[PDB]
Design an enzyme around this catalytic site. Structure first.
Site, mmCIF file in Angstrom:
data_model
loop_
_atom_site.group_PDB
_atom_site.id
_atom_site.type_symbol
_atom_site.label_atom_id
_atom_site.label_comp_id
_atom_site.label_asym_id
_atom_site.label_seq_id
_atom_site.Cartn_x
_atom_site.Cartn_y
_atom_site.Cartn_z
ATOM 1 N N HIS B 94 0.838 -1.200 0.000
ATOM 2 C CA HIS B 94 0.000 0.000 0.000
ATOM 3 C C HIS B 94 0.866 1.240 0.000
ATOM 4 C CE1 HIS B 94 -4.006 -1.545 0.205
ATOM 5 N NE2 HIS B 94 -3.394 -2.554 0.829
ATOM 6 N N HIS B 100 -6.049 -2.649 -3.043
ATOM 7 C CA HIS B 100 -6.422 -4.056 -2.978
ATOM 8 C C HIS B 100 -6.788 -4.626 -4.329
ATOM 9 C CE1 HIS B 100 -7.210 -3.133 1.416
ATOM 10 N NE2 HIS B 100 -6.057 -3.806 1.288
ATOM 11 N N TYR B 149 -8.306 -9.613 -0.777
ATOM 12 C CA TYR B 149 -8.944 -9.951 0.526
ATOM 13 C C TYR B 149 -9.452 -11.398 0.491
ATOM 14 C CZ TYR B 149 -9.104 -5.531 3.156
ATOM 15 O OH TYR B 149 -8.792 -4.430 3.899
HETATM 16 ZN ZN LIG Z 1 -4.831 -3.652 2.616
#
Ligand SMILES: [Zn+2]
Ligand SMILES: *[C@@H]1O[C@H](CO[C@@H]2O[C@@H](C)[C@@H](O)[C@@H](O)[C@@H]2O)[C@@H](O[C@@H]2O[C@H](CO)[C@@H](O[C@@H]3O[C@H](CO)[C@@H](O)[C@H](O)[C@@H]3O)[C@H](O)[C@H]2NC(C)=O)[C@H](O)[C@H]1NC(C)=O
Ligand SMILES: *[C@@H]1O[C@H](CO)[C@@H](O[C@@H]2O[C@H](CO)[C@@H](O[C@@H]3O[C@H](CO)[C@@H](O)[C@H](O)[C@H]3NC(C)=O)[C@H](O)[C@H]2NC(C)=O)[C@H](O)[C@H]1NC(C)=O
Ligand SMILES: *[C@@H]1O[C@H](CO)[C@@H](O[C@@H]2O[C@H](CO)[C@@H](O)[C@H](O)[C@H]2NC(C)=O)[C@H](O)[C@H]1NC(C)=O
Ligand SMILES: *[C@@H]1O[C@H](CO)[C@@H](O)[C@H](O)[C@H]1NC(C)=O
Ligand SMILES: [Ca+2]
Ligand SMILES: [Ca+2]
Lengths: 111, 535
Positions: B94, B100, B149
């Site tokens: 990041h 993401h 995720y």
């Molecule tokens: Zn993250």
């Protein structure tokens, strides 16, 4: 002299936070519909009562809350307490579950 | 998923502060993540020296980063449990301008979002950015991405996945926390114009006929065959005879000739960027017990000419003729070449040879101790739930004896493997301080790929601490002297501590995939090193 006032406040825009930092713990309403925020504040309070042998404390109200899901469900909270009164201090704390390891953290300031 | 605006790109080394609110375990996990960046990309880190932007890593609430270089310098947080190497790597990605993977513009082509199953107040964490904000870096959507995720993220109900792959196989894969994916590196390299990793100094699998620019000596008697993997049992380690006409290893027969005849295989010259390297390789020794695979360095004699031999390690045969791993700590600060002297002993009592493949040279400490669990798939079947394995006792740099318990079938987690470090009594214990606190354990299941950019080695990290206690030892510290805290074991003739680490270290459905198992050999590295100096 302040004669009268009214104020409108908001949590910072959830989209604009996500765009700035995707993993940041997004803030949420503190009301009793969020069982897991109440679990977070009561777990951090239980840890504080286990750490502090001189006095024991009870939850008055949850004043701020947020959560994040990266390592797993991770809740962060601020809440008020009284001994076992006017609320005696502000607590700060967390609850995190991985699938295997679990974590609770707490710090509290008396007024 | 990369932030398009080139102003948001760091300029290396990224200067960093570690805040003192970080535990030792978190400081050491950060520096270990930096080693992975330096090892797999041109991303580099330096201590802070007053630069305009820098990362400060923090133990704030949660585990999070602003995206890309904020030119004022920025917080990253690493809350509890985000000490895991892959979560540090995710947050540093990041920081390096990456969103993401499910936030790609095209993500809806690849993943379902079950908005109805998201917690109310958290649907925005599944927002997707337009292509003016983000590039694809001309890369596909990657389910194996570290930026993705997992299925159970922000869900109402623990049993119900928020996010699922439209190719349904990948439900078992999305949001892995092993390492960078190959596409995460491909993206990272396209983002920063990285062509060379800072620490991968060399690797070789012999797949090409130039043998990775190795050479054979002439001072020696003979030569290593570049061997075609074609003969009935004699397969390479890279491909294990999976691919026909294509696997290769260097082989040095010892079934004929005099004893003490040798062949040197000698690398191309190498320019070490650090004071220390680990030469990893895979080998067999199916010949005589008196055969000797000797590893040598030839280094610069300081004239600028590489001609100064230095013996660095010897390997000798066993009844285990299967491909075995090795690690040799080199300490080369000037240009050099690593050398393998295959040496015959008693050729009349040999039916085979010395074999090499999958050499890798990284500018790192070696793993402190390495355990190879043979026939691991077969062991995994034969293991009843709650049955255990214990590593031979390894010795750390400070002489602390230690070892790992492995329970292949975790009763705690059906379909998972449990790994738990313990301290062992050993020859040094009387001089060492106890409890052995502030020592960062790093267990690592090696992903057996010779090119370190292809590896996703699973790795978990904890630091010994006063926090670690049991009623089984009157709630004294687990890391106290094993004479007073461990249980004696006849097999090691040593006292082994209460063991600590992870149930659920890896799933069987994940260990089998990604080549961690390879030739039925679960290679676990361990490190167990002091980090008190980070305080
Ligand atoms: Zn993250
Ligand atoms: C000849 O070499 C063998 C071993 O080498 C293998 O057999 C040759 C004939 C060739 O085919 C080689 O290519 C091949 O690799 C020697 O036998 C081994 O000797 C060792 C050491 O003496 C034995 O180790 C001991 O084993 C016992 C238990 O069995 C342990 O308790 C001991 O701690 C110790 O480890 C080993 O068992 C033995 N292995 C086999 C398969 O026989 C052989 O002695 C040698 N002979 C001569 C005259 O040199
Ligand atoms: C990775 O390599 C890229 C090339 O493959 C580099 O991209 C180039 O960066 C230049 C600035 O360093 C750009 O120059 C600017 O171009 C625009 C018009 O497009 C002008 O308005 C600007 O005035 C001009 N800046 C200057 C100082 O002249 C190049 O256009 C740009 N090229 C491409 C194809 O993007 C990356 O900079 C490099 N990144 C890193 C981190 O190494
Ligand atoms: C979580 O989701 C599961 C699956 O949708 C729910 O499980 C079902 O619950 C009903 C009662 O409401 C049972 O009759 C079914 O047999 C259950 N199915 C399974 C697969 O066990 C579960 O109730 C949900 N829980 C919450 C708190 O939402
Ligand atoms: C591994 O398995 C094969 C059969 O699958 C067997 O022949 C061999 O002896 C085993 N080796 C070890 C070291 O257990
Ligand atoms: Ca030769
Ligand atoms: Ca090979």
């Amino acid at each position: 002299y302040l004669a009268a006032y009214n104020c409108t406040l908001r949590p910072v825009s959830k989209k604009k936070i996500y765009m700035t930092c995707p993993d940041c713990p997004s803030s949420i309403p503190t009301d009793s519909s969020n069982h897991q925020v109440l679990e977070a504040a009561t777990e951090s309070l239980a840890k504080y009562n286990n750490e502090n042998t001189s006095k024991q404390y009870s939850l008055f109200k949850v004043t701020r809350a947020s959560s994040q899901w990266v390592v797993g469900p991770s809740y962060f909270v601020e809440y008020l307490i009284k001994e076992s009164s006017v609320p005696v201090g502000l607590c700060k704390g967390s609850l995190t579950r991985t699938h295997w390891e679990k974590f609770v953290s707490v710090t509290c300031d008396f007024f | 998923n990369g932030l398009r605006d080139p102003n948001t790109r760091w300029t290396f080394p990224i200067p960093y502060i570690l805040a003192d609110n970080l535990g030792l375990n978190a400081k050491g996990a950060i520096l270990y993540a930096f080693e992975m960046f330096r090892l797999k990309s041109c991303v580099d880190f330096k201590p802070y020296e007053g630069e305009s932007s820098y990362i400060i890593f923090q133990q704030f609430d949660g585990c999070w980063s602003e995206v890309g270089d904020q030119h004022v310098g920025q917080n990253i947080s690493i809350g509890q449990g985000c000490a895991y190497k892959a979560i540090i790597e995710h947050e540093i990605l990041h920081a390096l301008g990456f969103y993401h993977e499910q936030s790609r513009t095209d993500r809806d082509d690849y993943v379902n979002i079950w908005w109805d199953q998201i917690l109310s107040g958290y649907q925005h964490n599944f927002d997707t950015y337009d292509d003016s904000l983000i590039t694809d870096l001309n890369t596909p959507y990657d389910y194996e991405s570290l930026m993705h995720y997992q299925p159970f993220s922000f869900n109402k109900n623990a049993s119900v996945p928020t996010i699922t792959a439209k190719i349904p196989e990948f439900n078992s894969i999305i949001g892995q926390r092993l390492d960078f994916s190959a596409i995460d590196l491909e993206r990272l390299n396209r983002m920063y114009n990285c062509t060379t990793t800072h620490t991968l100094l060399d690797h070789c699998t012999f797949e090409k006929a130039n043998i990775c620019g190795m050479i054979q000596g002439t001072r020696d008697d003979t030569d290593w065959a570049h061997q075609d993997s074609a003969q009935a049992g004699e397969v390479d380690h890279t491909l294990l005879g999976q691919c026909t006409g294509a696997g290769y290893f260097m082989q040095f027969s010892t079934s004929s000739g005099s004893a003490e005849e040798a062949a040197l295989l000698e690398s191309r010259i190498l320019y070490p960027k650090r004071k220390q390297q680990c030469l990893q390789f895979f080998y067999k020794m199916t010949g005589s017990p008196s055969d000797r695979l000797v590893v040598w360095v030839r280094r610069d004699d300081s004239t600028g000419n590489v001609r100064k031999l230095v013996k660095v390690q010897t390997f000798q045969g066993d009844d285990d003729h299967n491909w075995k791993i090795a690690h040799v700590v080199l300490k080369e600060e000037q240009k050099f070449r690593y050398l393998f002297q295959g040496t015959k002993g008693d050729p009349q009592n040999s039916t085979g040879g010395i074999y090499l493949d999958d050499i890798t040279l990284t500018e790192t400490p070696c793993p402190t101790g390495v355990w190879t669990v043979r026939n691991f798939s077969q062991v995994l079947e034969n293991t009843s739930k709650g049955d255990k394995l214990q590593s031979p006792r390894f010795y750390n740099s400070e002489g602390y004896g230690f070892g790992v318990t492995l329970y292949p079938n975790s009763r705690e987690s059906s379909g998972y493997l449990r790994l738990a470090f313990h301290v062992c009594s050993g020859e040094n214990d009387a001089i060492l301080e106890w409890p052995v606190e502030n020592r960062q354990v790093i267990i690592t299941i090696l992903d057996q790929e010779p090119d370190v950019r292809n590896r996703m080695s699973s790795s978990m990290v904890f630091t010994t601490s006063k926090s670690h206690t049991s009623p089984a030892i009157n709630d004294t510290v687990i890391w106290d002297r094993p004479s007073r805290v461990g249980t004696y074991h006849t097999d090691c003739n040593c006292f082994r501590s209460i063991d600590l680490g992870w149930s659920g270290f890896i799933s069987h459905q994940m260990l089998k995939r990604r080549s961690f198992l390879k030739n039925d050999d679960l290679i676990i590295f361990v490190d167990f090193e002091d980090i008190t100096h980070l305080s």
